[PDB]
C-alpha cells in the first residue's frame, strides 16, 4: 500500500490517471439508453444525470434495479427510479486533487468508487483498480 | 471530543439538529436580490444554485468575492460569478446519518461547514457551531 518508496509519486493528482469514458444514464423515458448502457458496460455501478449535455449528477444506479426496470417493461402487461429508490449523493473528486487526500475518502472511511467532478459537471467514475494501479505504476 | 461511554449519539441524527434558512443565491442576471444575501443572514460561504425551483448545490463563494463583483458592477462607470474562484459542495449530508458519522467527516478533513442534499434539492446547512452544541446539549 501507498506512501513509502522512491519519492516520485508524491507528485501525482487525480486527473493524471483517471479513466475518461462515461457509464452515465439520462433522466429520460428511453429504455434504449438503458439497453445501450447495459450492452456497452459491466460491473457494479452507473451514474444518473439531468441530461447528457448538462452533466449535473443526482446519484448512482446499479445493474439489478435497471435490468428489473427493463424486466418491468418485459412483464406480461398492456424511466422513474424514484418509484423504488435512488441512492446516496456520494463523495466527489475535483480534478486537481492529490492522491494523499483521495486515499482518505475511500479508507479510514467506507466508500467504494467516486465521480470526478467540476462545477455542476461529471468527468468520469474512479474505482479502486485505477487507484491501486496509480499507487504502484 | 468524541465521547467514550454512556451516550445517545446513536439515538439522534442530522435531520433532528437541522437548520434550514441559508445564504443561497440564484444563477440569475439581476443584482436586486443579491443585495439581500449581504445581510439577510450572517456567514462566510454562500450556496450557489442551478435554480430557485431546483436548488441543486452547484457550489460556494466567500462574501469577499461577491462584494467585489458588486463593487465592479457599481464602479464609477457610464451576471458574472463565473470567473471568480468557486468550489463544488465538497461533501454533502443525508437525513438518516447519526452524529458520529458526521463528526468523522468534519474532523478528518478540517472542513468547517456542510450542506444536506437528499438527492439534488438542498434542505439546510451545518457548521462547527451546531455540533459543538449538540454533542452536549
Residue numbers in the entry:
A (entry chain A), B (entry chain B): 567 to 644, 783 to 841
Excerpt from the publication:
CLC-2 is a voltage-gated chloride channel that contributes to electrical excitability and ion homeostasis in many different tissues. Among the nine mammalian CLC homologs, CLC-2 is uniquely activated by hyperpolarization, rather than depolarization, of the plasma membrane. The TM region of CLC-2 displays a typical CLC family symmetric homodimeric structure, with each subunit containing an independent Cl− pathway. All eukaryotic CLCs contain a pair of ‘cystathionine β-synthase’ (CBS) domains in their intracellular C-terminal domain (CTD).
While the TM domain could be resolved to 2.7 Å, the CTD exhibited poor density compared to the apo sample and did not allow us to confidently model the CTD when masking the whole protein for refinement. To improve the density quality, we masked the CTD only for refinement; this masking provided an acceptable density map at 4 Å and allowed us to confidently dock the CTD from apo structure. The orientation of the CTD in the AK-42-bound structure is the same as observed in the apo structure that shows N-terminal hairpin binding; the density for the J-K helix is weaker than in the apo dataset, but still sufficient to allow modeling of the helix.
